[PDB]
Copies of this chain bind each other. A is one copy, B any other.
Amino acid sequence: SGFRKMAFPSGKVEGCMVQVTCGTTTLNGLWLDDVVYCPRHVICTSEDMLNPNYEDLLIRKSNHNFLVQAGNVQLRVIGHSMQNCVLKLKVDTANPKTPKYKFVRIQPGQTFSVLACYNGSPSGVYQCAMRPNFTIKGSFLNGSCGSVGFNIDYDCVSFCYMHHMELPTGVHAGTDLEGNFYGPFVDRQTAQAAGTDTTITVNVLAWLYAAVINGDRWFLNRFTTTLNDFNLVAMKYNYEPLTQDHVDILGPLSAQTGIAVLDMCASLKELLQNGMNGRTILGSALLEDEFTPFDVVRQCS
Contacts and interface: CB of A to CB of B under 8 A. Distances in A.
Binding site of A, secondary structure by majority: helix, strand, loop or mixed?
loop
A125 B6 contact: yes
B3 A214 contact: no
A139 B299 CA distance: 8
A283 interface: yes
A4 interface: yes
A127 to B, nearest CB: 8
A301 B118 CA distance: 11
A9 interface: yes
A4 B5 CA distance: 10
A166 B4 CA distance: 15
A166 B126 contact: no
A35 interface: no
Contacts of A166: 1
A172 interface: yes
Given A4-B139, A10-B125, A11-B14, 4 more contacts: A4-B126, A9-B14, A123-B298, A170-B214
